[PDB]
Amino acid sequence: GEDGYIADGDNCTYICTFNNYCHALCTDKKGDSGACDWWVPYGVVCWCEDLPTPVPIRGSGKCR
């Protein structure tokens, strides 16, 4: 469906160092694939491709 940085129900991304971790995390959540992006406005977090609407991605605002 959509692409972006997988977040949790409280607007928080997931930290990473390796692409494998993000890949599994993303696939675990029905995505196509995933990779760790080292330079993002939130730090080094997971980015997913073709992630379903049931799963949230980061949006504008705070992580609480």
Side-chain angles (χ1 to χ4, degrees), residues 9 13 16 19 22 32-33 35 37 48 50 53-54 57 60 64:
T13 58
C16 57
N19 286 332
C22 291
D32 277 48
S33 65
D37 181 355
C48 301
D50 297 323
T53 62
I57 55 180
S60 179
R64 74 285 166 177

Side-chain angles (χ1 to χ4, degrees), residues 15-64:
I15 283 289
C16 57
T17 306
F18 310 84
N19 286 332
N20 195 12
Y21 165 62
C22 291
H23 183 70
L25 180 62
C26 290
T27 50
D28 268 332
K29 309 274 185 165
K30 312 293 174 177
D32 277 48
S33 65
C36 185
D37 181 355
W38 289 303
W39 316 120
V40 183
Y42 326 102
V44 175
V45 306
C46 290
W47 181 95
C48 301
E49 170 194 286
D50 297 323
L51 194 67
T53 62
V55 197
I57 55 180
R58 191 71 152 78
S60 179
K62 281 64 183 55
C63 148
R64 74 285 166 177

